[PDB]
Amino acid sequence: MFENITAAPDLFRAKINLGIGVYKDETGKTPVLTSVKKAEQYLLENETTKNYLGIDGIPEFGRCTQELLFGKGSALINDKRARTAQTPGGTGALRVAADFLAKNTSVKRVWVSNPSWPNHKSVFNSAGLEVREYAYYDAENHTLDFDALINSLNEAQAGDVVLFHGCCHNPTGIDPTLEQWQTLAQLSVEKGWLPLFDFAYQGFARGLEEDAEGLRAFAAMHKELIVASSYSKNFGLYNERVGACTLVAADSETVDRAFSQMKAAIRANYSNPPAHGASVVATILSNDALRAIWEQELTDMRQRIQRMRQLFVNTLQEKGANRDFSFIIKQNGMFSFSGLTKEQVLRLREEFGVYAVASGRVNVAGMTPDNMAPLCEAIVAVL
Amino acid sequence: MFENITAAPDLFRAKINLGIGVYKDETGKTPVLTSVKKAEQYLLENETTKNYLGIDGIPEFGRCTQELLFGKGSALINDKRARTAQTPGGTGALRVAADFLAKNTSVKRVWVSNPSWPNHKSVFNSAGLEVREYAYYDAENHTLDFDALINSLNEAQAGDVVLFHGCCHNPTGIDPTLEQWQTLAQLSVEKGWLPLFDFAYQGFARGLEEDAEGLRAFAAMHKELIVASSYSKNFGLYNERVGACTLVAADSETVDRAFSQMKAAIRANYSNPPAHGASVVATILSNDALRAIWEQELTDMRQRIQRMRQLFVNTLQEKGANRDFSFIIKQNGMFSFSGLTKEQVLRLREEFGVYAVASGRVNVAGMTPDNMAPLCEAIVAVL
Numbered sequence: 001m002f003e004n005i006t007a008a009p010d011l012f013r014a015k016i017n018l019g020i021g022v023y024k025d026e027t028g029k030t031p032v033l034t035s036v037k038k039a040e041q042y043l044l045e046n047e048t049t050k051n052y053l054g055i056d057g058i059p060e061f062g063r064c065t066q067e068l069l070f071g072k073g074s075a076l077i078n079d080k081r082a083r084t085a086q087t088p089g090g091t092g093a094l095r096v097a098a099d100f101l102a103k104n105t106s107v108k109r110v111w112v113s114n115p116s117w118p119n120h121k122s123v124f125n126s127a128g129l130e131v132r133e134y135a136y137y138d139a140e141n142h143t144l145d146f147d148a149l150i151n152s153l154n155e156a157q158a159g160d161v162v163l164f165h166g167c168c169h170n171p172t173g174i175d176p177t178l179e180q181w182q183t184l185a186q187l188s189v190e191k192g193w194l195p196l197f198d199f200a201y202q203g204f205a206r207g208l209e210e211d212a213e214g215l216r217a218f219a220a221m222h223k224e225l226i227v228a229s230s231y232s233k234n235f236g237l238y239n240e241r242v243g244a245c246t247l248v249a250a251d252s253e254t255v256d257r258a259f260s261q262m263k264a265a266i267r268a269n270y271s272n273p274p275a276h277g278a279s280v281v282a283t284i285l286s287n288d289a290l291r292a293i294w295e296q297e298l299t300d301m302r303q304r305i306q307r308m309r310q311l312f313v314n315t316l317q318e319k320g321a322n323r324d325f326s327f328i329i330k331q332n333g334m335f336s337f338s339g340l341t342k343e344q345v346l347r348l349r350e351e352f353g354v355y356a357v358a359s360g361r362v363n364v365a366g367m368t369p370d371n372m373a374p375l376c377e378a379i380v381a382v383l
Numbered sequence: 384m385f386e387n388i389t390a391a392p393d394l395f396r397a398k399i400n401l402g403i404g405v406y407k408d409e410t411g412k413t414p415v416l417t418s419v420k421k422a423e424q425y426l427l428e429n430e431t432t433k434n435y436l437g438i439d440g441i442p443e444f445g446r447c448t449q450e451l452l453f454g455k456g457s458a459l460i461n462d463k464r465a466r467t468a469q470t471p472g473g474t475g476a477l478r479v480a481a482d483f484l485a486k487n488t489s490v491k492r493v494w495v496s497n498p499s500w501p502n503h504k505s506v507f508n509s510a511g512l513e514v515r516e517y518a519y520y521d522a523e524n525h526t527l528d529f530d531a532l533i534n535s536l537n538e539a540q541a542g543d544v545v546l547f548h549g550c551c552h553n554p555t556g557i558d559p560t561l562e563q564w565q566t567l568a569q570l571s572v573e574k575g576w577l578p579l580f581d582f583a584y585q586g587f588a589r590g591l592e593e594d595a596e597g598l599r600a601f602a603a604m605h606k607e608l609i610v611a612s613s614y615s616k617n618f619g620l621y622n623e624r625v626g627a628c629t630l631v632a633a634d635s636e637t638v639d640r641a642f643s644q645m646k647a648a649i650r651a652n653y654s655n656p657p658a659h660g661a662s663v664v665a666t667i668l669s670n671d672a673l674r675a676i677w678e679q680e681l682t683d684m685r686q687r688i689q690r691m692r693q694l695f696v697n698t699l700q701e702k703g704a705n706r707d708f709s710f711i712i713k714q715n716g717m718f719s720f721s722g723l724t725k726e727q728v729l730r731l732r733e734e735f736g737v738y739a740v741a742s743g744r745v746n747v748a749g750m751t752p753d754n755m756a757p758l759c760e761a762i763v764a765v766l
């Protein structure tokens with residue numbers, strides 16, 4: 001049966017890693033957040049069973065998630081228009097959304113930005129959905145090519161899904177402004193798209209509430225949407241697989257009926273979700289003391305990334321780059337395109353032991369005050 | 384988009400629950416195992432990051448899993464013929480297997496026993512695979528209808544998958560004898576079936592090694608097979624979602640190549656698996672002291688279930704059932720068909736507040752010395 005299967009399509013370990021996918025602090029570590037350790041201690045002391053969660057996971061996790069996404073006192077919440085399933089990570093949330101859509105709706109196509117996270121195409125294609133790309137990146141001004149975006153999306157038909165990164169666009173760090181979000185929300189209504197928000201970085205651009213502005217602009221305009229959120233980066237809970245799939249419909253009857261089929265899609269996949277990480281998130285979010293400690297830890301990460309963006313631009317200037325890199329200061333989250341070509345990136349790896357992805361994306365959190373000068377000297381050397 | 388979706392296809396809470404799905408101790412609780420609490424304390428003290436696991440999860444978890452399944456010193460292990468991905472539960476392992484098979488092989492059909500766990504059909508159908516049933520249960524002798532099983536499976540074509548419960552058949556508690564396993568292994572080779580072992584209860588029939596005899600009889604005969612295993616019941620880790628998908632092929636080159644596609648199927652689903660539960664399992668299995676405590680806890684559960692099987696039969700006789708229920712003593716694991724009809728089960732619920740599933744399956748671990756007499760009086764009343 002397996003003898004003819006084709007293979008599916010480390011060098012760092014065998015120097016600086018900007019190709020990493022996680023947050024690193026100023027010492028180059030990805031420690032467990034203190035709020036998380038405190039919550040894990042509480043769970044160790046107080047859990048009396050590991051009995052299965054319901055298919056949609058811990059109720060308090062769902063409530064806290066909806067408040068994060070929509071705001072406390074949101075009409076969507078008041079009107080019981082949203083249902084949330086706790087999932088194994090943002091990836092699990094995307095796949096539950098894709099399976100739900102493939103099996104229960106006429107959706108055949110999802111629109112994703114060019115560029116995006118490479119796994120988007122894999123997830124949607126796995127559920128039998130085609131993926132189409134829309135223009136996004138103005139590589140000259142290192143900005144959002146808004147006109148190109150809108151012209152691309154004119155090819156999207158009514159009933160197609162359009163995926164939006166909520167904030168901290170991966171890989172570019174370029175997000176729509178609030179006005180641009182509002183223009184897109186209007187356009188999406190007019191064109192009949194189903195918005196799919198992928199929100200893996202809430203809190204890493206400007207703040208928890210600010211980073212949800214775009215989603216909230218869409219939620220104010222649409223009867224229906226889906227949000228796939230992740231707590232991997234903003235709680236440092238990567239390996240515990242903590243995300244959420246939130247379904248929004250016109251009213252409570254409709255969302256409950258549709259959500260029954262979302263739960264059926266989960267039941268046929270992994271049955272019910274992993275408790276430990278989501279219980280940590282619910283414990284923290286629902287406790288004033290822990291939430292305050294967590295919110296400050298997240299602010300500390302957001303700010304450290306900002307300081308590295310500024311230090312990177314300043315240090316490149318000091319090392320004689322003689323090029324405008326100011327765009328980096330304005331970009332949001334851990335990732336930016338450096339503007340280096342695939343061959344400069346290869347050179348960077350081979351001649352200097354500095355590792356980025358081939359697109360020239362760098363993880364600004366791999367940068368530290370200690371590694372910044374050698375890193376920038378290397379970049380200057382390949383310009 | 385959602386306005387026309389059909390709904391997917393508590394009374395207990397609103398008396399005795401034999402329709403429960405988990406182990407209960409003699410006090411009616413499903414506590415966290417002591418070995419698990421000790422491992423969780425160790426992890427709280429020693430974990431320094433939540434950085435993502437690889438797609439296939441914690442290496443030590445994979446090694447310990449293969450030793451459990453195949454035996455230490457197994458030729459499959461020595462010859463590097465097996466690769467294991469840690470998954471979110473046995474259900475996750477079944478779905479990864481189904482997605483792997485649907486996308487990378489010519490499999491179109493999976494054969495499942497009539498009866499089985501109801502979610503088998505949901506999982507395989509979700510991956511686009513048809514499910515066919517084979518005969519299993521001799522409702523007169525309350526035994527394995529082996530002739531019917533073999534005659535049913537004669538309809539299976541070469542290249543179909545046949546699913547076997549490794550031990551503690553759910554819902555019947557009726558397992559093949561070793562000789563019957565050996566006959567099935569031979570037949571499977573001759574007919575070209577791909578065996579899929581579902582092993583959710585290792586340790587609950589006679590013991591860890593004994594309960595793997597049937598799988599090992601198949602592994603001795605086949606170049607290829609897949610095992611979907613779960614640690615939910617044998618570690619009491621239900622909600623942490625701890626299982627494994629083990630792929631076996633003729634040699635190391637072939638299994639590595641095929642497993643690359645299994646990892647691609649995982650990447651497009653939930654990316655990488657939840658650490659906490661599998662880390663508990665790896666910590667326990669790899670430590671002589673913790674493993675000894677765990678093995679005794681599992682023995683305690685296995686034995687308590689045996690004592691309830693014996694107490695149930697004795698108590699039914701004492702309460703005037705006047706029917707042979709001796710078959711219960713011989714059956715394996717938490718589940719047995721009581722032999723009650725769907726209407727007797729309904730009556731049991733409505734008139735007596737005793738809850739079983741409509742098939743008459745009962746969870747023997749919902750039985751305790753304290754609840755046994757009323758439960759049996761109720762059953763006698765509906766006979």
Ligand SMILES: Cc1ncc(COP(=O)(O)O)c(CNc2csc(C(=O)O)c2)c1O
Nearest residue numbers: 020021089090091117170198200230232654
């Ligand atoms: C836009 C977007 N969508 C989905 C995901 C998946 O998040 P988790 O499944 O890890 O929670 C992520 C984060 N997953 C991820 C891990 S490394 C990485 C990268 O781009 O390096 C990305 C994301 O940035």
Ligand SMILES: Cc1ncc(COP(=O)(O)O)c(CNc2csc(C(=O)O)c2)c1O
Nearest residue numbers: 271403404472473474500553581583613615
């Ligand atoms: C034969 C078989 N296959 C797969 C599974 C799934 O196990 P987990 O996904 O819970 O690890 C299980 C256990 N899942 C389960 C939870 S309640 C239940 C039942 O039959 O009541 C079954 C099983 O018995």
